[PDB]
Amino acid sequence: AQVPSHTVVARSMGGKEDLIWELLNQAQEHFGKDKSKEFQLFSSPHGKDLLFKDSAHGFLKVPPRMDAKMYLGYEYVTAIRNLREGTCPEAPTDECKPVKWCALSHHERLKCDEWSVNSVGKIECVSAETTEDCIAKIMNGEADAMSLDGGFVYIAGKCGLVPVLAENYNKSDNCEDTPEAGYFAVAVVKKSASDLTWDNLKGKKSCHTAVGRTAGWNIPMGLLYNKINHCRFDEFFSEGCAPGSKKDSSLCKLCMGSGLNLCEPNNKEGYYGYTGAFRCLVEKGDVAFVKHQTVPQNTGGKNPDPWAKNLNEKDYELLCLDGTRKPVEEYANCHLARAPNHAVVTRKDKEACVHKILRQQQHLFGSNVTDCSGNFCLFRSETKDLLFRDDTVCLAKLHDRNTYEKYLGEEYVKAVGNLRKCSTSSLLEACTFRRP
Amino acid sequence: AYLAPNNLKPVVAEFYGSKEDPQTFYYAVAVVKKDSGFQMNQLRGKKSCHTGLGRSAGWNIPIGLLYCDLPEPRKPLEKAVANFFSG
Amino acid sequence: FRLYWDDLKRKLSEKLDSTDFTSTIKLLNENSYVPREAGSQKDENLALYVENQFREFKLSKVWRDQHFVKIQVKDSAQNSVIIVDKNGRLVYLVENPGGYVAYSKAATVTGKLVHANFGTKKDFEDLYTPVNGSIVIVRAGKITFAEKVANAESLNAIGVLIYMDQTKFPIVNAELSFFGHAHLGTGDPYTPGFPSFNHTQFPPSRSSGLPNIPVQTISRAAAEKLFGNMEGDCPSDWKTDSTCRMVTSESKNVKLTVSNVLKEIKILNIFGVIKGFVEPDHYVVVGAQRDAWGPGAAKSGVGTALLLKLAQMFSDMVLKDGFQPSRSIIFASWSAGDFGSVGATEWLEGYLSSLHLKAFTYINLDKAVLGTSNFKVSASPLLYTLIEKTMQNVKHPVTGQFLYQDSNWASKVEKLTLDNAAFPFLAYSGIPAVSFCFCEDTDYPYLGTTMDTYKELIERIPELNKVARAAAEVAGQFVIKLTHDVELNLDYERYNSQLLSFVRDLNQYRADIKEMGLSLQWLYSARGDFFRATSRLTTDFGNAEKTDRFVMKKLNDRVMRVEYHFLSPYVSPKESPFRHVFWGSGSHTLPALLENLKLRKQNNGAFNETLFRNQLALATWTIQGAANALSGDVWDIDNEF
Amino acid sequence: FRLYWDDLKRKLSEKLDSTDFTSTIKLLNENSYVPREAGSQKDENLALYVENQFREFKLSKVWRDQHFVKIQVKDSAQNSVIIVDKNGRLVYLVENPGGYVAYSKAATVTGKLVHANFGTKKDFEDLYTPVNGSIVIVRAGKITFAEKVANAESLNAIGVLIYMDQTKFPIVNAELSFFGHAHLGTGDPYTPGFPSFNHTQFPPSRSSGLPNIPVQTISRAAAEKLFGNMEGDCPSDWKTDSTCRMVTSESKNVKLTVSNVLKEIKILNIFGVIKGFVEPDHYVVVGAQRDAWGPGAAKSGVGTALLLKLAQMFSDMVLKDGFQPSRSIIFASWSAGDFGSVGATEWLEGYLSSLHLKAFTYINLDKAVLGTSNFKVSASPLLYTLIEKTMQNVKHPVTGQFLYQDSNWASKVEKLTLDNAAFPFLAYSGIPAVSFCFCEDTDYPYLGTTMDTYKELIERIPELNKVARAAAEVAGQFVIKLTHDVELNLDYERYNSQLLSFVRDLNQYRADIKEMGLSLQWLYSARGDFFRATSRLTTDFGNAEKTDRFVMKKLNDRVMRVEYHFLSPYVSPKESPFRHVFWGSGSHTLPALLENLKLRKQNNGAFNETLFRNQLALATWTIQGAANALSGDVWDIDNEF
Ligand SMILES: *[C@@H]1O[C@H](CO)[C@@H](O[C@@H]2O[C@H](CO)[C@@H](O)[C@H](O)[C@H]2NC(C)=O)[C@H](O)[C@H]1NC(C)=O
Ligand SMILES: *[C@@H]1O[C@H](CO)[C@@H](O[C@@H]2O[C@H](CO)[C@@H](O)[C@H](O)[C@H]2NC(C)=O)[C@H](O)[C@H]1NC(C)=O
Ligand SMILES: *[C@@H]1O[C@H](CO)[C@@H](O[C@@H]2O[C@H](CO)[C@@H](O)[C@H](O)[C@H]2NC(C)=O)[C@H](O)[C@H]1NC(C)=O
Ligand SMILES: *[C@@H]1O[C@H](CO)[C@@H](O[C@@H]2O[C@H](CO)[C@@H](O)[C@H](O)[C@H]2NC(C)=O)[C@H](O)[C@H]1NC(C)=O
C-alpha cells in the first residue's frame, strides 16, 4: 500500500506553525540537496533516520485547513480504527443503514428534522455552518450525502467524492431517466438604468449569489477574468455583494446581514443565494448574477414577501455579452454561459444505499404530492431555496456518468480551470496539497 | 497523537522524490531472503521483524492484510499476532 | 498475566458447569423455612442463614439493614363469603377462604355480583350492565390486582372478588387459595416518599394508591358455587369455561366480610459487596426476593438460590482465578417483596442521595425460571444491545440452538409492570434495570398459592439444573460485561429509536394540532437535536484513547447521566413518585400526552386542552433539555444560529 | 515559568492600578443610553455595544440569548390619586405621579386611608385601627414592595400607596417619583417554573405571587398634601417626621386609579466565556444588571462598568501575562433585572439540566458602590472563609486600614433578600452565591428614582475611582482564588455551625416536644452525624496527594455536591420554586418549622401539628440524608451499629 509521509507535529492552540516553517524553510534551502558539504540535515554519520528521514528530500507546508483526519484520508483511518478496535467486517450488504444527510444553520436543520420524522427513519440529519465545512464533514465521515451546485461538485469531486443523483428542472413523464441539459446563468439589470453594457461594468455596483457558485461566481468571473485579467475584483467594481468573501472587502461591506453575519455564506445572510441576490439588486444593486429562472419566480406576488409582491418583470431586464439589451422572456438569444444542474454527492461506499433510499424517498414526497400546505412536501420551501432548489420536479438517475469531470463537462471544467489560480477556498488548497 | 488529551496537529510534511517532482506518499514492501521459497498467505510460524508498534509500513499494513485470517479471540491484537508467528 | 473477555466467558462456563442448584432449591424448601411471611421468625432464620453464607464466602463487606413497616395480616375472625337470599331467612356458606388480599379495607358488603372479565378499562367499557352499587367478580390475569381494584373503584363498585379458572389456569384441584396485594404503586404505603426508619419519628401519612373497598380471593369451586345462582352467558370473545355466567339472579345476592388488621413488623434487608480495583465508587446491584406467603419455591426459592450460587461463583473467581473487576458489585437480598416490593422501595427512598448517579445498573433475578420454552426479557433500552450480545452466546437448555432466533426481538419487548422490582429502580431512581424469565406460553398456574413447592415444580419442569444453569449463566454475562472493562456497555441510540416511535405516533394527529393554533415543528427539531447529541458523543468515543483513563471518565459520566435526565424536574417526587417520562405513572409522562390527545378527537368534551398545552410545553422542553445536556458544554449549544 | 498566588495578587494590583472607571460610568450615562426600560431600543444599543466589546476583548466565545417576556408598562390614560369629599360635589387632585408600580392590578378604588408604617407583620399586629375595606399608605424601606402588598393583601385591604419621607430619605426636593415591582418571588410571572422561549408554545399559566389590588407610588409633597386631611399622631417609636398622621378624616376619603397594560417584549441576555486549561467543564458565573427605569447610574451603570473593565483585566491577563485558569469563567449581562430579575431566573429555568452540578459559584456585581463608610457582604456560608481571606488583603479606599476590622463579622451577615439576583441562584438552583456592597449607614436616597445620575453620584461620593477600584479588586480576588488551583476554596464547616444554631434554637422548646409524644433526640444524632461527615472529608483531604489530580476529582465532586443536597427532594419545583431548606420560601424550610412551633405555645389554636409532624420528619431526614451522602459510600454508612 501507499502511506502518507512523516510529519512534524505540534500542538494546536499554543502553536506555532509559522516559526517552525520559517526555520525549516531556511533548513531546506541550505541543507537539503547538497548545497553544503560541511553539514547535512538528511544524512548523518552517528546514525541514520535521526530527527528526519534519510529518503526525504524536502519539506512541504501543510495547509491550515487540513487536520489529522483529513491528512490520513478516510480508508487509512477506517482501517486503523478497525485494527485498533479489532473487528473484521463481514458486511452482507442486504439492508441499508440510515443516511446521515447534512444541513446548515437552523432553516436547513428545521426542514431536515421534519423530513427525518416524516420518513420512517431512513434519513437522519447532521448540521454544519458553511458548505465547505459540511463537505469536510462528509470526508472524515459524520455526514453521508448532500445536494450542492456544480461549483462545489468540482471541489468535492476533487476532494474524492462522487455525485449520484442530479436535479431535474423540467416537467416530463421521462424526467427521472432523461439527462437534462443544464440551466442558464444571466445578469439582471434595472430598467431605470439603460446605460449599462457588458463593455462597461467598471466602477459600477454588483450583486452575486455566493462565492464559489456557478451562476454567481464561475460563469461571471470567468468571462470577466478574460477581460480584467486581474485576480482581485474589489478594484474593478466600486462595491458589490458576494457573500463568502473576506471581511476586509467592499464586497462583504455592501451586503445586508447583521450583526456579525454579513458576508456569511448561509441562509442567515439576507442577501444570500438566488432570491437574496435579487433582493440585493432591487434594494441596492446595479447588476445581479442569478439564474434565468429567478425573475418569473419573484415577479408578481409569487412571493408573499412584500418587496417581491410589488414588483414586475417587464422592468427588470438582462444584458448581453456584446452589449445589446435583450428583453426578459428571451434568455436563449443571450445567456452568459450554461451551468450544469445541481447534483447530490456522497462517499463511494454509500453510493448504493443513498441511491436505493433516495429513489424510494422521491416517490413518496415528490412532485406529484399536491395539497402541499399542511402536509409534507420534500421540494417546496418558502423561497429560501433550502435543501434543494424549489423548482425541481424530480431527481434524475445517473448511470455511466459518476465522476466530477464527466458530470460537469468539458467547457465548465475548462472555465473553472481558467479561474483556478484565483480561487481562495482553503479546502481546495488542502485537496490539492494531498495530490502528489 | 491526534487523540485526546494529546490534541496534536500535523504542520509540516516532507517529500521523497527529486525536486523535479515531489512525492508525498511512499510504498510499503516486505523483504525476504533468496530461496526461502514461501508464499505470503501461509506465512504463519515464521520469524518477522517489525519497525515498531503502530508505525505505518511496519505494523498497520501487514497486520491489516493478515488480519481476518486469524481465529477468535482477536482482541487484544498483540496476543493474537503473538500466537500467529512463532516469535 | 491479564484476563480478557473470552477467558472470562470460558471460565464462567467451566466453573458454572460443576455446581448443582437443585440441592439448594431443595434446601430452601425444608421444614425449617417453609412458611415465610414478611417479618416472621422463619424469615429471620433464612436471613441469618444468608448473612452467614455471605460471611462465609469471604466477600469484601457484608452488612445488614432493618426497617419497620406496616403490613396487612389476618385475624382471628374468619373472612367469608355468603349467598344471601332476598328473603334473608336462611344463610348459605360458600367457603372460608385461606387466601386474603393485602391492603384491602376492613368492611362487610352485601349486594349483587357482576362478572367483569379482567377489569381492564377496555373490558369495563364493553360491559352490558351498570356497575354502580354492586360487587364485581374478575378472573386473575393480564394486570396486577391493584389496577383491577382501582378501575372497579373508579366505576363506583363496592367490592371485588377475584378467582382463577380452568382455561387460563389448568390445575387439577379446584380448592387451593392464593394471595395478592392491592396497593397501586410500590413501597410501604404509610410512608410515601420518605423512608421508614426510626429517624423519621413515624408521622401520620397515607399514600393515595390504597383502595377503599373490600377485596377477596376465592377458589375455583367457590366460583362455580356462585355460578350456580348466576345467569346470562359469557361472550365467545372471552376465552373462558362453559360454566361462567354474567350477573346474579334477581332474588339472591352475595355478601362478603373481610377482616384484616395492620401489623407493624421488622424488615431485614441483607447486603454484600465485592470491591472494585479501578474505581470502587460505581457499582451494579443484583437483587432477589426472599419471602412469599406459601412455600414459595418458584417465587422466592429460585431467585435466592441463583443469588447464593452466583455470589459463590463471583467471589470464588475473584479470590482464586485472578479476575479483577473494575467496578464494585453489590448483592442484595430483600424481605417483603410480596407486599408490593417494599424492600427495594424503602432502600431507594432511604439512600437516594447516596446512590444518586453512583449506581448504574440493577439486575433482577426474581422469577427467573417458570417455563422451558420461551425466553422473555424486559429492560430499559440502554441495556438492549447488551442483551443482544448475551443472547448470541448462551445456549438454550433443551435444544442446542442459541437464544438469538428472532432478529426483531426488540419489537416484542414490553413494558415493565408494576409488580416487578425493576420498576421502582427504573421509574423512581433513574437506574437502568433488566428482568428476564424462561417463561412458558401459558401462565404458571400456581404462583402465589399454597401449592407452589418443589414437588410440583420438578413435576412441571422435568430437568431443572440445566435451566437454572442457563439463567445463572445469562446473569453472569451481564455482570462480567459491565464490569470487566473501562468502557460501559450501555447504548443510547436505542433511546433515539424510542423517540422516533413517539413522534411518528403524534404525527398522526398533526391536523388537530395545526388547528389549535399550535405548531408541532419544535418537537421535530427536539428529536433531531437529540440525534445530533448521540452522534456527537459516538464520535467523541471515536477520537479518544481507550487505554487512557481520565478522558474516558469524563465521557462515562455523560453516559451515566443520560438516564437521569429523562426524569421530569417539574413534578413533586412525594406526590407522584415514578417520574420517568417514558416509563412512569401519572399525567406528566409521554403516553399520557398521547392519550389525552386521543380524547380530543373523541369530542365528548372530556379533554382539558390547557393541560394539553402544559404537557406539550414540558415534554418538549424535557426532550430538548436532555438533548442539550448530552452534547457538550453550555456555549457549545446552538439555538437559532 | 509558572505563576503562584502572590504573583496573581500583585499583578492584579498592578494592572488594576492603571485603568479608570470614571469615564466608563460617564459613558453609560450618555444621551445615547439614558432611558433604559426593558426591551427598549436603547437597551438593544447598549446590548450590541457590550457584545461588541466582548468580541473586541478576544474572549474565547461570545454568545447571545433572547427571550420573550410579559412586563407591565404605562398607558395613555394617566394614573392618579384624588381626595374625594363625602359630598362628592367637587374633586381635588393630588398629583399625576410619574412613577408606577409594576405588576399592579388595573383597577380604581375609593376609600379611607390608614398609615401602616412599614407593612411588616409586626407593624400590622400593633396597629390601632382595623384594616379591612380600606387603603393603606406605607413608607419605603426595610422590605421589598411585594411583601408589603402581600401582607396588606393578607389583611384584606384594597389598595396600597407607597412613599418615601424625610427621616429615612433626606432629599432636597419633594417632587421626584420612583419605581418598583410587586411580584412576590422572581421570574417572568406568566411562565412559572419553565422558561419563556419559543419552544414552549406560551401556554396559559399564572404565578401565585401576583397581587390583586392596585398599588401606586407617590411623591413626598403628595404625601404631605394627603397629611393635610389626615389626623392622629404617629407613635414616637416610629422614627418619622412631624407632619405624619394616622388615619383619614371622617368626611374625606381618597381614590386612586391605576391603569397599566401588559406588553410582551424581547429580553436580550449577553454572555462571554474564557475557557479553562485543566478542566473547562466547571465554571464560575459573574453577573451584572443592565437596565433601570430612570437613568440608572448607581443601579445599573456601576455594575456594567465593573463588568466590562473586569472582563478586560482577566482577558488581558490570560492573553498576555500567561495566567492559566484551571476552570472556565462565564461573564454575563442580563436585561430586565428591574422587574424582579427575570434574566437570571429565565436563564436558570432554561438551562437547569445543563448546569446541574457543573457551575459552582455565582458572583453578583450589582449595586456594588453606594456608600464609602461600611463594607456589607451577604453570601452562602461555603464562601465565608473565602471572604475572610479577601477581607484581609484588600485595602479600604478612604483609610489605609484593611477591611478586616471586626472578628465577629460572621454574626452580622444577614439573609439574601428577594430582590437580589443571588437569591434565585442560591435558593433555586443550589449554587453558592455572594453579593457585596460598600454601603452607607443610611439608605441610598434616590435609588429607583428619576434623579439617579452621575452628577448626584459624584456629588455624593467625592472620589469614585478609588472606591470602584476597591470593589473591582475584591471581585477579582474571588475569581482568582476559585480558579487558580486544583483545590476549590469552598468551606463546609460553616454549614456545620449553622446547624448548631438551629438545634440550639429548637432546644428551647424541648418540653413541648416531650409532651407531644415526640422525641427530639434523632435530630441531635442527625447534627452530630453531619459533624462526622465533614470531619471525615477533612481528613480525606489530609491523606491525599495534592499534585495528583484524579484523586482530587473524586473529592471535589463531593464538595460541589454538598450544596445541592440541601435542596428538599419532597416539594414540587413548579409549585414552590425556592426549595433550599436554610434559605428558601414556603412551609418546608427550617425557620418555617421553628415559626410554627412558636405558634404551638401561642395556644390560640392556630397551629397545625400534623403539618408539624411532617415538617419534623422531612427536615430530620433531609439533614440526615445529606450527612450520609457526604461521608463515603453506601456500605460505609453506619446506622444502629
Ligand atoms: C421540457 O420537457 C418537455 C417534455 O415534457 C419537452 O417537450 C418536448 O418539446 C418538443 C418541442 O417543443 C416537442 O417536439 C416534443 O414532442 C416534446 N416532448 C414530449 C411532448 O414528450 C421540452 O423540450 C423540454 N424543454 C427543454 C428546454 O428541455
Ligand atoms: C423504632 O421504632 C420501632 C417501631 O416499630 C420501635 O419498636 C416498637 O416500640 C414499641 C414501643 O415500645 C413496642 O411495640 C415495641 O418495643 C416495638 N414494636 C415492635 C413490633 O417491635 C422502637 O422502639 C424504635 N426505636 C428503636 C431504637 O428501635
Ligand atoms: C384543565 O386542566 C387544568 C390544569 O390542571 C385544571 O384547571 C385548573 O388547574 C389549576 C392548576 O392546578 C388549578 O389551580 C385550578 O383550580 C383548576 N381549575 C379549576 C376550575 O379547578 C383542570 O383540571 C382542567 N379543567 C378546567 C376547567 O380547567
Ligand atoms: C416566538 O414567539 C413570539 C410570540 O410571543 C414571536 O414574537 C412576537 O410575535 C408576534 C406575532 O407575530 C408579534 O407581536 C411579533 O412578531 C413579535 N413581538 C415582538 C418581537 O415583540 C416570535 O416571532 C416567535 N418566534 C418564532 C421564530 O416564531
Ligand SMILES: *[C@@H]1O[C@H](CO)[C@@H](O[C@@H]2O[C@H](CO)[C@@H](O)[C@H](O)[C@H]2NC(C)=O)[C@H](O)[C@H]1NC(C)=O
Ligand atoms: C393541618 O395540616 C395539613 C397540611 O398538610 C392541612 O391540610 C391537609 O392537606 C392535605 C394535603 O394538602 C390533605 O390531606 C387535606 O387537604 C388536609 N388534610 C386533612 C386531614 O384535612 C390541614 O388542613 C391542617 N389542619 C388545620 C386544622 O389547619
Ligand SMILES: *[C@@H]1O[C@H](CO)[C@@H](O)[C@H](O)[C@H]1NC(C)=O
Ligand atoms: C403520483 O401519485 C400517485 C398516487 O400517490 C402514484 O400512484 C403515482 O405513481 C405518482 N406519480 C409519480 C410520477 O410519482
Ligand SMILES: *[C@@H]1O[C@H](CO)[C@@H](O)[C@H](O)[C@H]1NC(C)=O
Ligand atoms: C349509581 O347509584 C344509583 C343506583 O343505581 C343510581 O341511581 C345512580 O344514578 C348511579 N350513579 C351515581 C353516580 O350514583
Ligand SMILES: *[C@@H]1O[C@H](CO)[C@@H](O)[C@H](O)[C@H]1NC(C)=O
Ligand atoms: C370590616 O370593617 C367593617 C367596617 O365597615 C366592620 O363593620 C367589620 O366588623 C369589619 N370586619 C370584621 C371581620 O371585623
Ligand SMILES: [Ca+2]
Ligand atoms: Ca417510604
Ligand SMILES: [Ca+2]
Ligand atoms: Ca419562567
Ligand SMILES: [Fe+3]
Ligand atoms: Fe445553482
